[PDB]
């Protein structure tokens, strides 16, 4: 019974628990795309004022 618990827990651990190392790689990358899109959203609004002159 003790042997099964450790084996079973690892079986469940792989399915449910996340790997924080590979998750931080994704989390950091999505921050920059959020930052990149926000700045390009700023320039999108400023793009309109060209015709005012």
């Amino acid at each position: 019974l003790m042997n099964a618990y450790e084996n079973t827990q690892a079986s469940e651990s792989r399915i449910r628990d996340t790997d924080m190392a590979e998750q931080m790689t994704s989390f950091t990358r999505y921050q920059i795309l959020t930052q990149a899109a926000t700045s390009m959203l700023a320039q999108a609004n400023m793009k309109s004022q060209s015709v005012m002159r």
């Binding site: 019974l1 003790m2 099964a4 618990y5 079973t8």
Partner: protein
């Protein structure tokens, strides 16, 4: 469940070991009467002696 299953087998080991603790007591008593018997098969004992032995 496997964690729960482990505990019951541990509790079950306690109950099994408990009963055998009493069985040890009885065997000591039974073997005492057994050795008490072989002294009462001796031929140099008066009736009071084998009566006194019986009381124990």
């Amino acid at each position: 469940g496997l964690r729960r299953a482990e505990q019951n087998t541990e509790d079950g080991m306690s109950l099994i070991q408990t009963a055998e603790g009493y069985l040890q007591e009885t065997h000591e008593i039974v073997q005492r009467v057994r050795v008490l018997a072989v002294q009462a098969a001796n031929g140099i004992y008066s009736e009071e002696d084998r009566q006194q032995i019986q009381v124990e």
